[PDB]
Amino acid sequence: SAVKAARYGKDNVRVYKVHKDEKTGVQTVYEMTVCVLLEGEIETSYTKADNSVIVATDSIKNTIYITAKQNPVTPPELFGSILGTHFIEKYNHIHAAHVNIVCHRWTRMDIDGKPHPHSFIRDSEEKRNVQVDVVEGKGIDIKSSLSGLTVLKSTNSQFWGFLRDEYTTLKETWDRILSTDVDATWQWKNFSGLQEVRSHVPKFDATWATAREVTLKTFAEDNSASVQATMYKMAEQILARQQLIETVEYSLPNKHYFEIDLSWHKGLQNTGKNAEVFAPQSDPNGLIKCTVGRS
Amino acid sequence: SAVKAARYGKDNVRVYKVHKDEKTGVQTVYEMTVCVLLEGEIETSYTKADNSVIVATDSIKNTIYITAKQNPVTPPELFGSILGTHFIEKYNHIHAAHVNIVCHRWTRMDIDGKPHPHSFIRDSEEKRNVQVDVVEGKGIDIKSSLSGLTVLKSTNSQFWGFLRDEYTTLKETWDRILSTDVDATWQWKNFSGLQEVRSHVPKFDATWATAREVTLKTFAEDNSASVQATMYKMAEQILARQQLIETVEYSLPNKHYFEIDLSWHKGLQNTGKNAEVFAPQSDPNGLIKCTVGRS
Amino acid sequence: SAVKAARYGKDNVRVYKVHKDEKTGVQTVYEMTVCVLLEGEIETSYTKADNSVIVATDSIKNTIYITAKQNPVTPPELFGSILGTHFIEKYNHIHAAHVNIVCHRWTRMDIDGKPHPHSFIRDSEEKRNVQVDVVEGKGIDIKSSLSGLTVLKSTNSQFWGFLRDEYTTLKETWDRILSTDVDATWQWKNFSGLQEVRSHVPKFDATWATAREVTLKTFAEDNSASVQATMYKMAEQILARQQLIETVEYSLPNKHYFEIDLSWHKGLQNTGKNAEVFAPQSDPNGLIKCTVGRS
Amino acid sequence: SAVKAARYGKDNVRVYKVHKDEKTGVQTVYEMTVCVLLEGEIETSYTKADNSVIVATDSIKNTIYITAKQNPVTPPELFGSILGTHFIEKYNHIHAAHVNIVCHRWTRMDIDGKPHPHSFIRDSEEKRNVQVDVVEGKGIDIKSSLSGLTVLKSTNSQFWGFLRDEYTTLKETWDRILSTDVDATWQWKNFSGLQEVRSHVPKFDATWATAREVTLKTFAEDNSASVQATMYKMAEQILARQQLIETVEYSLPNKHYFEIDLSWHKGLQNTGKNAEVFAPQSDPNGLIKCTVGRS
Ligand SMILES: O=c1[nH]c(=O)c2nn[nH]c2[nH]1
Ligand SMILES: O=c1[nH]c(=O)c2nn[nH]c2[nH]1
Ligand SMILES: O=c1[nH]c(=O)c2nn[nH]c2[nH]1
Ligand SMILES: O=c1[nH]c(=O)c2nn[nH]c2[nH]1
Ligand code: NA
Ligand code: NA
Ligand code: NA
Ligand code: NA
């Protein structure tokens, strides 16, 4: 037998960092969960019990903390690039590093209309994420994403004109609830190394903000013909606004809210134009995906 | 043997309701999870297989939907009172109804600085809850709460002067991170019935808003001597602002963020005044509770 | 204002202990999650920022580890009694200790038909729990439980003869699926102190085993008239088998599996006697509770 | 812009099926969670609001139920192949179907030493899974797996001889706890179609059983030099026992149990050879992966 692929490292490394502005007293906090997996000339640890090639996972953990102490942790695209580059440069036999970062929200509190200098709220379980693959000789590949953005619109969603056959019971509709949890990923053009990543630093936060804004505005304003049609419009707009993105991927569940026929009870009307009370369905759910690129 | 206590009903009933203003086009959505448990002269269903005394749990579910169709679902204190009263009035042998409601956030989206008429975001997993106990002959007891409000302050928290003995390793500190998930409950004076609950309807939303505001402002502004001391200040202020509340209860975890000594690595300084990178701890956690009432 | 109640301590303390038999080489492992909350003359920590009365939660954590090192951790009723007694005896101003223990399963593996001396499997998320309340002057109150025991029977469950009115749509049935997650609690007679708890040590494991056996056998064998009727039979039998138990409480969800009418598709018959494929429902669920005591 | 990839369908479809042996009275239950995603000539649903190419996700759900009614649901490799083949044969414009099945445990209860004919227990959250990709013109690709198998050994695990540099604090050890959650996947050779899958039906359950047995026996018996070395031995043995498997992949977390130094308290010895009480760590965790194939 032979090792066809192998990677190993440390997952679920929770990290907090504070920045203190000595002039103003304002403090800013960052909290992340980090995973680093390494690849390289490590097969003999599997086949021959040769631990000499293993950078211990505990040491990977220490390295995450040290790197966060010595470098900016924002934007996460930069921090993940620094962290990944470290492993391939430090260890001759390590040839790829895969860094995943989940950023948690700590939003500054407003107290009496004023931003508070050192108090924060978790205002959403929405995350901002990065996946950074640093491969020796092949540069740095970055996928940025937002996830856990949960939205609902109560009208201006339709679904008609779909295929009807002997397996079909769904009725066409011109007015339904649309609710989803948005997972959106933008893949950057390959970067040659850390100097090129640093040269683009301003674009990372700006592109995250644009992706979020486009997602929310398009969801709210589109008189949606389907999840498919609405998500394509979102992706097109993101590509138009940032030329350094190569592809945009969306993964959207369709979280169903069913009408409840109450006509058996005193003729109560609660369907169609009279629908007011609905039953949210926990499962099953539709799942719609698309990857959009340039022509 | 004998039945000393019994209650039964339906849990995890998900309910959505939409209100449509025909004049303006503005729609407003409400989403809740409801549990109703009944008590009364039901022991023979347990002891003698006598199902004639059972209002089926499926029928309880139907009743929740019908009641939501025919009545306001907000404030939840009112809806829960209507729902509980229904069971004790409709069924002669049912003498108590226990209604728990969890309200989920659907906050109206702002698009280009304007509130959108029919699009919403789940802006927090914070919940607004009610527990309503309707007992025949004894009125209506309401406990209102907020839960899942997660906050952090990066300084202006201290903890010194605690008991030190042979079990103690904790160092005194004059500057630490304080983070918690707030669970706050206010218990209303007993109401005689639905007419009295209706007479106080404006106070329910106002008191929830006050409880939230006091919690956030006190957390942000107090130079905290302990979780205990800060939570007592919150409770006092809520009692001062609403005379119809009898008690306020807080349950606060102390979610620890530990310093990381990096001095073993090239003498890096990351403790005390030099602490920048911390390790959030998933467990264990402190748990601090208090119930405050009037003198 | 005044403090009406207060308790504080440490939650989610994970503990593992190994026992090694030097004669045989056999090792046995125990893993628990422990919470300890204290009460006593502690109000001034809340009202006056007086930390001198606070046994730090970190010290409570240390005490859990030390107590586990120096004492048996099984049965959990004994360990929780030792731990709770420690706090009220050590600290003059602490007058009650509330200890909750969740025991996790590590079942010895059988390899080639033989029990392995040091390898274990988590064979269920079923838990064995204890709640121990040690109150100065009032002895030791112990509630023992099992939870997370998930069962299903595919026939020999009925539900007919329930109340039918204008809120009822449920059809009577003489053959349905019954599935639940069992939470069963037995409350021991009050014990005067640790000497009396020790005197009854053999009864704790034996009574847990009996409660589990009775639950499973009664569920499997009863031609159930309702959840209510079946759970009462379980409780009666436990009380009959252990005279030192005062009450038994069951809390059972009714986890619904719905028939799927497929007759719209080529006349396929999948209801009633022809039902083979069902839709498990995640929510809502029935919730049935009873507490049974002696006459 | 252009659609580079697209797939859509229904997730989290819960399905139960019962088989009743009329001769013996014995009933057997199966419960699964199914996801089906389709690909094909569907881009215009995204780009042009053309729903005529959409087989509605609701219809996919109906098809899962109908297919389960008309066909065996075990082994899951067969059921997933039937389900996937259905979509590519029924719909000319659908060219791939991706079927994921999670099988939940319902193990027959033993009551008084005898297997009960119709009562079952969820004896583990361990799952048996399949991923079946049916691609028009390219056959059927099946990946079978087990997941959620949680094990611990209290000794006979070592970890020494790893790389030591300025980032390393971990001490070498010759005796530690090893605990993990096993995720093991075996990838079958490509099958030409449903006839070939049916021809191999007996091998599916047998290979699952072998994979489980090899995993448990190797974990229990290996005096482990590292997670890496132990998992490679498991994979080699599975490949040796089933020639129709092309690769085996393991993904193993290293769930750390830390020693607790108690020497600060009365010189208590709880490290090294005296270690009895340990602190299980919820995070971070090591994560070790390998894919093994033939030479
Ligand atoms: O937007 C939708 N897309 C779909 O593919 C679908 N199928 N059922 N409902 C649906 N709604
Ligand atoms: O605010 C705090 N209260 C406590 O009771 C405590 N114990 N350890 N740390 C603590 N912090
Ligand atoms: O066993 C049952 N008990 C109940 O109270 C009930 N209500 N609906 N179905 C039920 N099944
Ligand atoms: O088995 C192990 N493998 C590793 O790669 C490792 N790193 N720290 N500890 C470890 N244990
Ligand atoms: Na390298
Ligand atoms: Na009544
Ligand atoms: Na005392
Ligand atoms: Na086809």
Numbering used by the authors:
A (entry chain A), B (entry chain A), C (entry chain A), D (entry chain A): 1 to 295
Please quote the authors directly.
Cofactor-independent urate oxidase (UOX) is an ∼137 kDa tetrameric enzyme essential for uric acid (UA) catabolism in many organisms. UA is first oxidized by O2 to de­hydro­isourate (DHU) via a peroxo intermediate. At different stages of the reaction both catalytic O2 and water occupy the ‘peroxo hole’ above the organic substrate. UOX belongs to a group of intriguing cofactor-independent oxidases and oxygenases that rely on their organic substrates for O2 activation.
